[PDB]
Design a protein around this ligand. Structure first.
Ligand code: K
Ligand code: K
Ligand code: K
Ligand code: K
Ligand code: K
Ligand code: K
Ligand code: K
Ligand code: K
Ligand code: K
Ligand code: K
Ligand code: K
Ligand code: K
Ligand code: K
Ligand code: K
Ligand code: MG
Lengths: 74, 65, 182, 48, 130, 83, 125
RNA sequence: ACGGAGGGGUACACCAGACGUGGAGUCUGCGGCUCAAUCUGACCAACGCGCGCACCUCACCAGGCCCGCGCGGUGGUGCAUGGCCGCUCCCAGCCCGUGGCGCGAGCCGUGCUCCAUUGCGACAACGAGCGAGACCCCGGCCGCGGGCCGCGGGACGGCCCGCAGCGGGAGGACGGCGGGGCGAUAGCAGGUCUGUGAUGCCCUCCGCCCUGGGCCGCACGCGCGCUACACUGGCGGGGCCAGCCGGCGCCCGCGAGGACGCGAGCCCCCGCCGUGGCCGGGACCGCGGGCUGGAACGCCCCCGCGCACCAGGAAUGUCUUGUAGGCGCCCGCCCCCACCGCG
C-alpha cells in the first residue's frame, strides 16, 4: 500500500493542506522547548525566556503547494 | 468587582438605541442579538460579546423603570 | 523521528535569510521563504540582473531554483525603510521625517524612529521622532506592529536606528477592540 | 612541522558566532545561548 | 482463584508448600548476600528465598498473556538507598537471586520460554489456580 | 607559490563562462569537500585573490561566501587557456 | 449496556455495567483497607454486575474516582422517573463529591522558588 | 524632592498561624592568606550569578615549535559607544489639536465608586491617543468530525431578595473564571567591549599550536543550600499506584559492571529493636574490585573504621487550595560526575 507523512509547525497551514487532500481521495504533538536566561551577561534578577516549537504530523493511508510543509512517502 | 470599561458601555448604548424593538430584558435573546451582522455589530470575540450583551440586558430593564 | 529533517530546514532558512540580508543589502532584501526559494524584494529588476547573470550565480552558492515576487507597498514594510535611513546616515531630523512622510503616505496609522549613539560632544543620547498612533502591548503587537533595527558603522562609534510602523487596517484580521455598529 | 594539531578533542562551537561556551546541543541545534535569543524568531521558536 | 485470595495469604502459604516435593529448594550462595544494593543488611527471616520465589511466581501468574523478563523483575522489588548526606535515590534489586529462581522454575515445566522472556506455562498455571 | 596542480584544482571549482561559485567553511576531513586539498592551501590563494580583486566576498555563519567578478575570470582565462 | 466515568486528580475510572470487580480484584479486597468504607458508601447508604478499570493518579485519588464511578453507574439504569432525580439528591445530601468531580489540580512551578508559591530565602549581608 | 506635617487609599507588609534560616557536619560562591600562577567581572538591584574547569575550555604560570619532545589578538577603556538585560515599577501613570489664564517659568484639560486616570457625575474647557483592559497560551464541563487531536458551544455580576456599584441566596463543571505571556512616557555615568565578522580611539605585533601546572591550593569571617538530632522513628520481608514522556531480552558477576541479541518514593501489611549518642546520625580514614578516557587527580561498588550533633543566642526570611510541608522523578551543561537550576 501507500503512506503519506506530513509534518508542519503552523497548525493553520497543516489543517488547510490536510483538509484539501481529502478533497482528492499515534501521531501526537511534541514540543521542542528551550529555557535560557534573558540577559547576555549574568547580572541582575535571574529571569528566564521559555521558547517553544510545536510540530504537527498526519499519516494518510492509501492503497496544493505550500512553502513550509514537509511531505514524505514511505 | 467587575466594572465595565467605556468600550463596553459606548457600544451597548448605540446597540440599545438602534435596536430597542428587538431586545427583550432577558439575556439569551440579547446574546443572540449581539451576534447578527445585519443589526450590524462587528464583535471580534465571544467574551467581549458576552460582556456587551450583559450590559445591554441591564440597559433594557432600566428604561422601563 | 521525522522532525530532525524539518528542524534542519528551519535552521537553513535562517542561514539563507542572513546571507540575503548581508549581501543583497544593495537591492533592499526584506524577507525569504523555503519550500525552491521565494525572495520578497522591492525591485526584482536588479536581483535578476542583466541576462540573469547575477541571479544564477547565486543559485550555485546554494549547492555548496529561485523565484522572486515584488513588494507592492514599500512604505508599510519597516525593514527596507531602516535600510533607506541607513543610507542617509544628512541631518537626523530631516532623514527621520522623510522616512515618516513616506510611511504615512503608504497609509500607516502610525510610525516612529529612534536614533541613538554619537551625536555631539562625546556623549551618547537618544532622539525619538514620531507621528500618528502606535501600540506596544499584548498579542496584537506581534501582528499589527512592525519593527526593524540596524547599526550604522559611523566615523565615530556605532549608531543604532530603529523604525516601527503600525498598520491595523490591512488585508488580514481585525484589532480585537475596534467595534463598528450601525 | 608535523605536530600542529595532534591533540584530539571536540571543538564544538556555535553555528552562528564561533564561541565555545554555553552551546545548546539538545535536538541538534548546536548554537550558543546569546545567539539563540535573536535568531530564535526565524528558526521557529516563539514564546507563549 | 489466584486473583481472589488476599495477596499476602497466598504468598506465605505457598512458600511453606515450597518445602515439599523437592521444588526450587534454595542454593548455597543464599548466605552473605543482600537482596539489593540499596539494602544495608541481609534478610533475617531464614525462609526468605522461599517467600521471594513464591512472590515471583505469583507475579508471573498475573501476566498470563505476555512475558516479564528478569531485569524487569529486579525493578519490581526496588528500594531507596539511604545514608549518604545527599538526597535519596532508588536502586534496582539483584538479578542473580531472581535469575537463580527463574532458572529452577523453568524446570519442573512450571514455565516456558518465549520470544523474549519467561511465561507462565499451562502447567504451573494450573497448579497456582488449584 | 607551493604547488601547481592544487593551484589549478582551485581553478577547477571556478568556471570561466559557467555560473558555479565557491563557498568556504574556514576550518583553519581536513580537506575542502570540493576537491581533496588541505584547507590552508585554499585559504592562502583566497587571501591573494581577494587582495587582487578576482572575487568579491561577503561572510555569514563561519562560512566564506565568494562570487567570481568580471576582472577575475579574465585573470583566470590566461591561467586555464580558454577562449 | 451502561458506560460511566469517575475522575480525581489524574485518576480515571471507566465503569461498564450490566444487569463488583476493581481492576479484576474483588472490591472487598481493595488494598488500602482503612479507607474500605469509602469505596462502599453508595451501596451501604442506598444487585447487578459492574466492571471497573481505574488508571493514573495515586492510591487515594483512585479510591475517590471509583467512589464516583460506582455511584454514577447505578444512576444510568434508572431513568426518566422520580427515582432518577431523587436518588441523586439523597447522594449529594451526604457528599456532593459523589456526583460532581473535584476540579482542583496541581499548579505550575515558577522560576525563583521550589514550589508554585514558595520563593527563595532573601539576604542583605 | 523631602518632612519625627494633616487627610484619603493599599500589599503576606503586619495581624492569627504555619514552615524555616541563624547553632552541628557538609556541597557550593565570596573576602582574605598563600602561591611560579592560584586568570578575571559584579559589593534592596554582587555572593548554586556570568549553563557540569583531569586535556580541551583558557583569559593565568614554566618551557618550546611556526608565519621537555596590513592581518589578526577575549589586551585596555561599559565614564567613548550600539544591542540586550536589570532597576525606579508591574507603579497607574503619560500626553496631543483648538480654545482660555499669566510679562514669564507654568496652569487648566488631567465627590461617589472599582484590582486599577476602572467608571458614574460635575466642571473654561471641548475633542483624541498611549498605558489599563481587551488580546495570546494552558487547564476544568458539553457537542459535530476524524482516529486520544482539532473544530466549536459554555459565564454574562445573567437569576431572586436588600440598599456606577457594595451585600446575601440559587442553579451550574466552574461565580465574579484560575495560573502564565506581553508590557506606556521619562530615566540610571548600575551590568556587559571576555558571546559574535557589532564597534571608535589607545597598545601589541598579547597571533596560532604542543607538553606539563594553576583556576580545586587554607589559621579565618560571611551568602544560597544538603543531611540530621529519632519511637508521629530506624530496620527485614511482602503489596500496590504517577506525570513532565519512555527500549529491554539472554547469559556471567555479592555488587558495581561486562560479553553477546531483538523491539517511583512516601503509603499499606506482617515482624524486629526498646529511650541506652542504641540497631539515631554517617563525616573522616584503611585494604580491595570496576567504569570513563591518550591520560584519574573523576565517579561507582564491598568489607572495616563509627565525627560533630539532645532542636539551636542576639537577630532574621517565605507563605492563604490541591496552596505550605513531606516524597520522589526527569531535562540542561555533560568523557565521568548534582548536594544546582528549569520543570
Ligand atoms: K545576579
Ligand atoms: K507558558
Ligand atoms: K544568584
Ligand atoms: K475667559
Ligand atoms: K501667553
Ligand atoms: K480653569
Ligand atoms: K478645573
Ligand atoms: K495639566
Ligand atoms: K488640577
Ligand atoms: K475639571
Ligand atoms: K482531525
Ligand atoms: K487531526
Ligand atoms: K450574556
Ligand atoms: K556586547
Ligand atoms: Mg586547563
Amino acid at each position: 500500500k501507500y503512506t503519506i507523512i506530513v509534518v508542519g509547525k503552523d497548525l493553520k497551514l497543516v489543517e488547510r493542506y490536510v483538509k484539501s487532500i481529502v478533497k482528492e481521495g499515534r501521531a501526537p504533538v511534541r514540543r521542542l522547548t528551550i529555557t535560557t536566561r534573558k540577559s547576555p551577561c549574568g547580572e541582575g534578577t535571574n529571569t528566564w525566556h521559555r521558547f517553544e516549537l510545536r510540530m504537527y504530523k498526519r499519516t494518510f493511508w492509501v492503497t496544493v503547494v505550500i512553502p513550509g510543509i514537509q511531505v514524505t512517502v514511505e | 468587582g467587575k466594572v465595565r470599561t467605556k468600550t463596553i458601555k459606548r457600544a451597548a448604548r448605540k446597540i440599545v438605541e438602534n435596536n430597542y424593538e428587538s431586545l427583550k430584558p432577558k439575556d439569551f435573546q440579547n446574546n443572540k442579538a449581539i451576534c447578527s451582522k445585519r443589526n450590524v455589530a462587528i464583535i471580534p470575540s465571544k467574551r467581549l460579546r458576552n460582556k456587551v450583551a450583559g450590559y445591554v440586558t441591564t440597559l433594557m430593564n432600566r428604561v422601563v423603570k | 523521528v521525522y522532525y530532525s529533517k524539518y528542524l534542519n530546514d528551519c535552521i537553513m532558512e535562517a542561514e539563507l535569510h542572513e546571507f540575503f540580508s548581508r549581501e543583497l543589502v544593495d537591492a533592499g532584501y526584506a524577507s525569504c521563504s523555503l519550500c525552491c526559494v521565494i525572495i520578497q524584494c522591492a525591485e526584482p529588476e536588479v536581483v535578476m540582473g542583466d541576462n540573469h547573470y547575477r541571479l544564477h550565480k547565486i543559485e550555485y552558492l546554494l549547492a555548496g531554483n529561485i523565484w522572486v515576487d515584488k513588494i507592492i507597498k514599500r512604505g508599510l514594510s519597516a525593514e527596507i525603510m531602516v535600510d533607506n535611513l541607513r543610507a542617509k546616515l544628512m541631518p537626523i531630523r530631516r532623514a527621520a521625517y522623510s522616512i515618516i512622510r513616506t510611511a504615512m503616505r503608504a497609509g500607516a496609522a502610525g510610525c516612529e524612529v529612534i536614533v541613538a549613539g554619537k551625536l555631539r560632544a562625546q556623549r551618547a543620547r537618544a532622539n525619538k521622532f514620531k507621528e500618528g498612533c502606535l501600540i506596544s502591548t499584548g498579542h496584537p503587537k506581534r501582528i499589527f506592529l512592525a519593527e526593524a533595527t540596524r547599526h550604522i558603522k559611523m566615523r565615530q562609534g556605532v549608531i543604532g536606528v530603529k523604525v516601527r510602523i503600525y498598520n491595523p487596517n490591512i488585508r488580514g484580521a481585525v484589532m480585537p477592540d475596534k467595534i463598528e455598529i450601525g | 612541522e608535523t605536530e600542529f594539531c595532534t591533540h584530539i578533542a571536540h571543538k564544538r562551537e556555535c553555528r552562528i558566532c564561533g564561541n565555545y561556551n554555553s552551546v545548546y546541543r539538545k535536538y541538534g541545534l548546536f548554537i550558543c545561548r546569546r545567539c539563540f535569543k535573536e535568531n530564535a524568531g526565524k528558526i521557529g521558536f516563539v514564546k507563549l | 482463584s489466584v486473583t481472589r485470595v488476599p495477596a499476602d495469604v497466598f504468598i506465605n502459604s505457598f512458600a511453606a508448600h515450597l518445602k515439599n516435593r523437592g521444588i526450587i529448594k534454595c542454593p548455597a550462595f543464599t548466605d552473605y548476600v543482600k537482596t539489593g544494593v540499596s539494602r544495608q543488611y541481609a534478610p533475617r527471616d531464614a525462609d526468605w528465598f522461599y517467600i521471594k520465589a513464591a512472590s515471583v511466581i505469583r507475579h508471573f501468574y498475573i501476566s498470563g498473556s505476555h512475558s516479564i523478563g528478569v531485569a524487569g523483575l529486579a525493578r519490581k522489588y526496588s528500594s531507596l538507598q539511604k545514608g549518604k548526606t545527599t538526597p535519596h535515590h532508588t536502586k534496582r534489586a539483584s538479578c542473580k537471586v531472581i535469575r537463580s529462581i527463574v532458572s529452577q522454575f523453568l524446570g519442573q515445566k512450571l514455565l516456558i520460554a518465549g520470544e523474549r522472556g519467561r511465561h507462565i506455562s499451562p502447567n504451573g498455571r494450573k497448579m497456582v489456580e488449584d | 607559490m607551493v604547488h601547481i596542480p592544487k593551484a589549478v584544482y582551485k581553478a577547477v571549482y571556478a568556471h570561466l563562462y559557467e555560473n558555479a561559485s565557491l563557498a568556504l567553511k574556514e576550518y583553519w576531513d581536513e580537506n575542502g569537500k570540493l576537491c581533496n586539498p588541505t584547507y590552508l592551501h585554499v585559504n592562502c590563494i583566497m587571501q591573494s585573490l581577494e587582495s587582487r580583486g578576482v572575487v568579491k566576498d561577503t561572510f555569514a555563519w563561519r562560512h566564506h561566501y565568494y562570487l567570481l567578478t568580471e576582472k577575475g575570470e579574465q585573470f583566470i582565462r590566461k591561467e586555464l587557456d580558454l577562449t | 449496556t451502561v458506560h460511566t466515568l469517575g475522575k480525581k486528580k489524574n485518576s480515571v475510572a471507566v465503569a461498564f455495567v450490566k444487569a463488583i470487580l476493581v481492576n479484576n480484584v474483588p472490591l472487598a479486597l481493595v488494598r488500602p483497607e482503612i479507607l474500605r468504607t469509602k469505596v462502599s458508601e453508595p451501596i451501604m447508604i442506598l444487585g447487578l454486575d459492574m466492571n471497573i478499570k481505574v488508571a493514573g493518579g495515586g492510591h487515594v485519588s483512585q479510591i475517590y474516582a471509583v467512589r464516583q464511578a460506582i455511584s454514577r453507574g447505578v444512576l444510568a439504569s434508572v431513568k426518566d422517573e422520580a427515582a432518577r432525580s431523587e436518588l441523586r439528591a439523597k447522594l449529594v445530601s451526604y457528599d456532593r463529591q459523589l456526583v460532581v468531580s473535584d476540579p482542583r489540580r496541581c499548579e505550575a512551578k515558577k522560576f525563583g522558588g521550589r514550589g508554585a508559591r514558595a520563593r527563595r530565602q532573601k539576604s542583605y549581608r
